[PDB]
Paper text:
The small protein AcrZ in Escherichia coli interacts with the transmembrane portion of the multidrug efflux pump AcrB and increases resistance of the bacterium to a subset of the antibiotic substrates of that transporter. AcrB is the energy-transducing component of a tripartite multidrug efflux machinery that includes the outer membrane protein TolC and the periplasmic bridging partner AcrA. To investigate how AcrZ affects AcrB, we determined cryo-EM structures of AcrB and the AcrBZ complex reconstituted in a disc in which a bilayer of E. coli lipids is encircled by the membrane scaffold protein saposin A (Frauenfeld et al., 2016). Trimeric AcrB cycles through three states in the transport process, and DARPin associates with the subunits in the loose (L) and tight (T) states, but not with the periplasmic region of the open state (O).
To test the effects of cardiolipin on the conformation of AcrB and AcrBZ, we reconstituted the proteins into saposin discs in which the E. coli lipids were supplemented with an additional 5% cardiolipin (i.e., to ∼10% total abundance). Minor changes were seen when comparing the AcrBZ complexes in the presence and absence of excess cardiolipin. The greatest changes were seen in comparing AcrB with natural lipids with AcrBZ in the lipid environment with added cardiolipin. (A) Channel 2 entry is restricted by a loop region of PC1/2 (light red) for substrate entry from the outer leaflet of the inner membrane in case of AcrB in L state but open in the case of the AcrBZ complex in L (dark red). (B) Once substrate enters the protomer in L, a switch loop (red) allows passage into the deep-binding pocket in AcrB in complex with AcrZ. When AcrBZ saposin discs with supplementary cardiolipin were prepared with the addition of chloramphenicol, additional density was found in the cryo-EM map in the distal pocket of the AcrB protomer in the T state, which could be easily fitted with a molecule of the antibiotic. The chloramphenicol only becomes visible in the T state pocket in the case of AcrBZ with additional cardiolipin. These data suggest that the presence of AcrZ and cardiolipin can influence the occupancy of the substrate in the binding pocket. Molecular dynamics simulations also indicate that chloramphenicol is bound more stably to the binding site of the T protomer of the AcrBZ +10% cardiolipin structure compared with the AcrB structure. Our cryo-EM maps suggest that cardiolipin and AcrZ together also seem to encourage a more discrete binding mode for chloramphenicol in the AcrB distal pocket.
Author numbering:
A (entry chain B): 1 to 1033
B (entry chain D): 11 to 166
C (entry chain H): 1 to 37
D (entry chain A): 101 to 250
E (entry chain C): 51 to 100
F (entry chain A): 301 to 350
G (entry chain C): 851 to 900
């Protein structure tokens, strides 16, 4: 093939131009994101039964839904959480690669076939189905900084003036709101209701009657009379549009004649429809917009457009409203990807510099800096075709492929220049000769790299997607590289390369280059002599090799595994969890304390504290809270003590000194649709009959038995909430009937007063809002305020609750949770530092085996994945090894020679492991991909050495030792060029401190170690293997 | 309240006896009250912890305490099937015929739940069967409504 | 302009440095293996 | 999948028109074939359990799990789940001047799960140091609790 | 039995907000009548699976 | 595959069965579809040998 | 017209507009390839210009 292009350089230029154009169009037409869809698709059914207890919803809504969650495809598991705030969250997790849309609609329909089984209150409030995997891109804040306008006014202004625009914006998918728009709050007073002998039922009925809509008809409608000339639509009374209108509502007419209104016995307000959650941005009331990115969109352009659209609307805002942008993680994406691109360009430049240092000619260095861009643009095109995006994983795969891209072009050009300098031939015949030497080796190299990088694209779970990204991008790059090297690179080596006479290898040319030539010649002679001496006795080295292998194995077993490194995304989280029976005033005190700490002690590294009171990552109540802390730009946080690790440690140590609270600070992890990903999540289930109490007892027994193995298990904790007090009311019906009281009225009064009641809707400023009816806080605060509530009997005589209440105290759970339709209790844990999660998980299985009857266990989250992806790596790498052996036997036409190439793997693996053990890294994904890269490059080098040796022993009839020596001599230069270029392109990733330091370091450390160790040891050991193998066979 | 009182409440509701003895050594308020008026005795009786009830009544625990509605540890140990705890609270000066803020007695509860051994050991120490709730229903009417016949026989 | 120049200079410096390091490692290891043979 | 989707979209357009006595039982839309792949059976070797008890165990602890296992389209239980069967008697009903309507109102009233709010709800007062969820009534769980009814 | 504006405020403007975040969408129109009947029409790009 | 999943799930709920409850299979079209393919494969092997 | 009153095209017009905006590129692309492919069949940069 290459001889078809050495005579036709313009056809090769044309192919190159086509690839460049395709890659450019792609680059302009590609998404951009931090990470691809890695977490398995999940869907959340969210419901709300206001003024209810976890048992109430768990019995009336959750069990029902879970029962009707039958007949759905590719369901992997199901969880459910029921809180005392009335909310319900059922989370269905499907297999990977499932088209979340069809699953969402499946579950939505199976639910629509269950709505008639729930009570009218849930149907009224509305059951929603959302996609839970996709997390937020940014969060927009809105504060007052002016005459205090409650957060509800801000939420209404947002929902009415800053939500339609943000949703019409490009790239914006789901747009969620933190607060709720206005609602007609009607706070009733039992005393002013007893005055006029009323109840809340009367208020509810009156509102339902005097805020409804009525269909009337038409004025001259069909069938019409003969002669009719007018048809006009009729409009009867409609919904109301203010508080004054709601005031002029007739509840009664006193015997004397006076008419009772609502203005009298009920305060009327425009307020939020839910106060359970509160938000404060630096001690200022705020509202928030959650923004999600749509499939196939660019995060950077989307965020830019959002910021533009929000700058447009500053003119039209009340005095005292400013957007402040908490939780914006697009800058981290920008910086990481820009740094990777910087790395690619620096590698393109270092290739130039190295080729100039080694060859001393500009026309030869022009060649590799023409080929690598072509291959990168072709890779971009392939990504665009296969429906991929530009993200951290893809771009790091490109970085790791730069090494192979450089290797190919350097090999071609260097061999051609060598031939032209030695045999004095011109560029065309020299290139023909080089290609004849090199093309088969290049094809075998491509197929070997394929066998190495492909089988990782068949792992199962969330890690499979990461490996897929890496594998596909690297394989595309390598394939395009071999195609180019066989198509374009020769076409350029045959035209650009200017001829030079024979005998002119570098001797002379006074200066730094005339000196490097002679130094490299001296080093080449020394290395050749050392190899020749090594080949006199080889057994001395087949033992050092086993020593190296054993060291590699020891380092591999002593290398702690991992999933991904934590980074400094510019934000982190703080978590606040008070004791059982707390309120939200106390939680807000604690949150203001945290805010003061952050804005006073860490004033130099912090910009904001978005404190949300009412929502903790595990539970919803006044007892919980979180705080998003957003830090200044990294350019303004110079230092390691000013990073997120150190800030977190300091804040945790400081908040350890807070009383009646468990305040922690943690770093926003890697991919957020996932979680901590310690590979440890556990669920106890009552598979037969048992209730909550025996299940809690079993949970505590397991925690006790787990605290007795602190050498395998640590921080074994439940994620749920512990039981708290409940105010029981044992109503009696005998007395209630003897007094003529409708139990339904009793319950409606109780609920509407203390819990609330969605009554109807109203229309304000062109929007439909609700109408809630509740009590004035003063009369709900304590049990002694219940006797203050009276019901209307049949005989028109009021009755106090104290006549039948018979109240008590009890203990019950505020958060129940189920796993696959069965009651469950979750448990979070970790493997003791020094062991794997498999040992911990097996131990927990053995412990659960010693639990009471009817209690079983099940794994969720990454643990579930870690029960699938644990038995794949060895099989797939065995497949890789066999395929590589076969490709090499084909390339060399011998079943034994390939071994000389399949023993240079530890020579790079041990370097990678040494570098990782020094820098203090883990066996994460980037490290594995770097390992494969080093293996591939060392295999390139060994393959070419062996091919040169064999071609010399066959064609030129040379011997074994002479051929080996001549091969190593001919191959030393390009090996060093490739190794140096790649080490230099990787150095920044190793010495990086800032945005992306984690992944950059995990990549570069291993890659550099492998490069050094292989470059240095292969050139000594591959000859030994070749000689030994050709002798024993 | 005080740090040690809160820690002792936590220990009692969780059921750690060694920590209870320790907190007792440091002079903890054995009468420490929760926000709903409960005490370590209330908790150890609710959750059925026995060793803790002993350890408490040995270090000066108030046995006839009462919460914000009048439920002493007997009202709790009665309708949860706790025999040893009832015996202990009785051998230490518990009002076997107390009342809540709604006129309720341990017999009412032991009858509602259908317990018998509790009712027996309560009658032994002077459990007035003929006490009237705030509605006018004694343990006999409760047993008759529950449909339990052996309880009614024991009560007659 | 500033970035390209700075990176180019960083390279012009660290290229022969790393080349010397690698060639010296090769020299040392070849001497070691000459002694072990 | 698309077929089931369209069928459900058209059926949702009719369910409002059906009787509540039908919506409550539950309308189902399945992709099932017309032939029984398999038939699992459950028996008691001790001879103490009847068909009703075995069927209830199957329906409570074995069916909802098998109706989700990635390939099952429909499940037909060869029995029936438990339920509170209330066998009325017209003679004893007339003796007390009653009717089934009263027996139904009494149950819908006294067997309920009431939403009763919580103490310290939101928005609370300044100085509130307490929060607790109220409990007023719960779904009954035994034949005795159903006999207690008034 | 609802005026046009009534529908436009209670149904049309309520449903026209979510739809802005759909994939491969081209444009959308909507009509709100006096008989209460309301119609929304979303048009997607060519080459889309309906 | 569906029958395998079903049998696995049943094996995952049997340990919690009360005393006496045993599972039986009076209808299964799976064993036929396994043994038939096995017989065809045996035939292929015999044919190779012949 | 007054300010705040904009205009747009839907239906056929939309497509029509698109067409007018798609062609200028369509001519360029469809030319480039011919200049290139020619240069491939006949290795020269001049006769494709001719």
């Amino acid at each position: 093939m290459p001889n078809f292009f050495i005579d036709r350089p313009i056809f090769a230029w044309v192919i190159a131009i086509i690839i460049m154009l395709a890659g450019g169009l792609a680059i302009l037409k590609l998404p951009v994101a931090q990470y691809p869809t890695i977490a398995p698709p999940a869907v959340t059914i969210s419901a709300s039964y206001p003024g209810a207890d976890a048992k109430t919803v768990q019995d009336t809504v959750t069990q029902v839904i879970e029962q009707n969650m039958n007949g759905i495809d590719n369901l992997m598991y199901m969880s459910s959480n029921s809180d005392s705030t009335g909310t319900v969250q059922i989370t269905l997790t499907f297999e990977s690669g499932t088209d979340a849309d069809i699953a969402q609609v499946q579950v939505q329909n199976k639910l629509q076939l269950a709505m008639p089984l729930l009570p009218q209150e849930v149907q009224q409030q509305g059951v929603s189905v959302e996609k839970s995997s996709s997390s937020f891109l940014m969060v927009v804040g809105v504060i007052n900084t002016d005459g205090t306008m409650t957060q509800e006014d801000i939420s209404d202004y947002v929902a009415a003036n800053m939500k339609d625009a943000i949703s019409r914006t490009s790239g914006v998918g789901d747009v969620q709101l933190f607060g709720s728009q206005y609602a007609m709050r009607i706070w009733m007073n039992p005393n002013e209701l007893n005055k006029f002998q009323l109840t809340p039922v009367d208020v509810i009925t009156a509102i339902k009657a005097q805020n409804a809509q009525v269909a009337a008809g038409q004025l001259g409608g069909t069938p019409p009379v003969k002669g009719q000339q007018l048809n006009a639509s009729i409009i009867a009374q409609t919904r109301l549009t203010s508080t004054e209108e709601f005031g002029k509502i007739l509840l009664k007419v006193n015997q004397d004649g006076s008419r009772v209104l609502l203005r009298d016995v009920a305060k009327i307000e425009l307020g939020g429809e839910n106060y359970d959650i509160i938000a404060e941005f630096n001690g200022q009331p705020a509202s928030g917009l959650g923004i999600k990115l749509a499939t196939g969109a660019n995060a950077l352009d989307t965020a830019a457009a959002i910021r533009a659209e929000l700058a447009k609307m500053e003119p039209f805002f009340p005095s005292g409203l400013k957007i402040v942008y908490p939780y914006d993680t697009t800058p981290f994406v920008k910086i990481s990807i820009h740094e990777v691109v910087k790395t690619l360009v620096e590698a393109i430049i270092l290739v130039f510099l190295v080729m100039y240092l080694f060859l001393q000619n500009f026309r030869a260095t022009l060649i590799p800096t023409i080929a690598v861009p072509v291959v990168l643009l072709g890779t971009f095109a392939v990504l665009a075709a296969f429906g991929f995006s530009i993200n951290t994983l893809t771009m790091f795969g490109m970085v790791l492929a730069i090494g192979l891209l450089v290797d190919d072009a350097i090999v071609v050009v260097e061999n051609v220049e060598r031939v032209m300098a030695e045999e004095g031939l011109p560029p065309k015949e020299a290139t023909r000769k080089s290609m004849g030497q090199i093309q088969g080796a290049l094809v075998g190299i491509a197929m070997v790299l394929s066998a190495v990088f492909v089988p990782m694209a068949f792992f199962g779970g969330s890690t499979g997607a990461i490996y897929r990204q890496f594998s596909i991008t690297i394989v595309s790059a390598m394939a395009l590289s071999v195609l180019v090297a066989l198509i374009l690179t020769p076409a350029l080596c045959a035209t650009m390369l200017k001829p030079i006479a024979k005998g002119d290898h570098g001797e002379g040319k006074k200066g730094f280059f005339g000196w490097f030539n002679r130094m490299f010649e001296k080093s080449t002679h020394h290395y050749t002599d050392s190899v020749g001496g090594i080949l006199r006795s080889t057994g001395r080295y087949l033992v050092l090799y086993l020593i190296i292998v054993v060291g590699m194995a020891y380092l591999f077993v002593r290398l702690p595994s991992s999933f991904l490194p934590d980074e400094d995304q510019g934000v982190f989280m703080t978590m606040v969890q008070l004791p059982a029976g707390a309120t939200q005033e106390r939680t807000q005190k604690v949150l203001n304390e945290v805010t003061h700490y952050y804005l006073t002690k860490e004033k130099n590294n912090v910009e904001s504290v978005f404190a949300v009171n009412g929502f903790g990552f595990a539970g919803r109540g006044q007892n919980t809270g979180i705080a998003f802390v957003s830090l200044k730009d990294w350019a303004d946080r110079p230092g390691e003590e000013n990073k997120v690790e150190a800030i977190t440690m300091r804040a945790t140590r400081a908040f350890s000194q807070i009383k009646d609270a468990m305040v922690f600070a943690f770093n926003l992890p890697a991919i957020v649709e996932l979680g901590t990903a310690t590979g440890f999540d556990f669920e106890l289930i009552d598979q037969a009959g048992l209730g909550h109490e025996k299940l809690t007892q079993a949970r505590n027994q397991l925690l006790a038995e787990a605290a007795k193995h602190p050498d395998m298990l640590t921080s074994v904790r439940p994620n749920g909430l512990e039981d708290t007090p409940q105010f029981k009311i044992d109503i009696d019906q005998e007395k209630a009937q003897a007094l003529g009281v409708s139990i339904n009225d009793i319950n409606t009064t109780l609920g509407a007063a203390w819990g609330g009641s969605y009554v109807n809707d109203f229309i304000d400023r062109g929007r439909v809002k609700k109408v809630y009816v509740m009590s004035e806080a003063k009369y709900r605060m304590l049990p002694d305020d219940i006797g203050d509530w009276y019901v209307r009997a049949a005989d028109g005589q009021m009755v106090p609750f104290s006549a039948f209440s018979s109240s008590r105290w009890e203990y019950g759970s505020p958060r129940l949770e189920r796993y696959n339709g069965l009651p469950s209790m979750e448990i979070l844990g970790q493997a003791a530092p020094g062991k794997s999660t498999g040992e911990a998980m097996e131990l927990m299985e053995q412990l659960a085996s010693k639990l009471p009857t009817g209690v079983g266990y099940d794994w969720t989250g990454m643990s579930y994945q870690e029960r699938l992806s644990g038995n794949q790596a060895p099989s797939l790498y065995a497949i890789s090894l066999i395929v590589v052996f076969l490709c090499l036997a084909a390339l060399y036409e011998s079943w034994s020679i390939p071994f000389s190439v399949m023993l240079v793997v530890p020579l790079g693996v041990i370097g990678a492991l040494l570098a990782a053990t020094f820098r203090g890294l883990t066996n994460d994904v980037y490290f594995q991909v770097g390992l494969l890269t080093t293996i591939g490059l060392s295999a390139k080098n060994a393959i070419l050495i062996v091919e040169f040796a064999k071609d010399l022993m066959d064609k030129e009839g040379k011997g074994l030792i002479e051929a080996t020596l001549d091969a190593v001599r001919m191959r030393l230069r390009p090996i060093l060029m490739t190794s140096l270029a790649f080490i230099l392109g990787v150095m920044p990733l190793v010495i990086s401190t800032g945005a992306g330091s984690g992944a950059q370091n995990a990549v570069g450390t291993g890659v550099m170690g492998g490069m050094v160790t292989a470059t240095v040891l292969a050139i000594f050991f591959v000859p030994v293997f070749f000689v030994v193998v050709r002798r024993r066979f | 309240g005080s740090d040690l009182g809160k820690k002792l409440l936590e220990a009692a509701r969780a059921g750690r006896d060694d920590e209870v003895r320790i907190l007792m050594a440091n002079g903890a308020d054995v009468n420490a009250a929760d926000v709903v008026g409960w005490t370590p005795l209330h908790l150890a009786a609710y959750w059925g912890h026995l060793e803790i009830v002993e350890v408490l009544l040995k270090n000066g625990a108030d046995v006839n305490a009462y919460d914000t509605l009048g439920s002493t540890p007997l009202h709790l140990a009665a309708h949860f099937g706790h025999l040893e705890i009832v015996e202990v609270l009785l051998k230490n000066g518990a009002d076997v015929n107390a009342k809540d803020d709604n006129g309720i007695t341990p017999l009412h509860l032991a009858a509602n739940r259908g317990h018998l051994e509790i009712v027996e050991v309560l009658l032994k120490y002077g459990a007035d069967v003929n006490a009237q709730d705030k509605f006018g229903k004694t343990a006999f009417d409760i047993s008759i409504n529950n449909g339990n016949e052996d309880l009614a026989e024991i009560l007659q | 302009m500033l970035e390209l120049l700075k990176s180019l200079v960083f390279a012009v410096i660290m290229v022969p440095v790393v080349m010397a390091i690698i060639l010296g490692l090769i020299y040392g290891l070849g001497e070691v293996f000459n002694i072990f043979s």
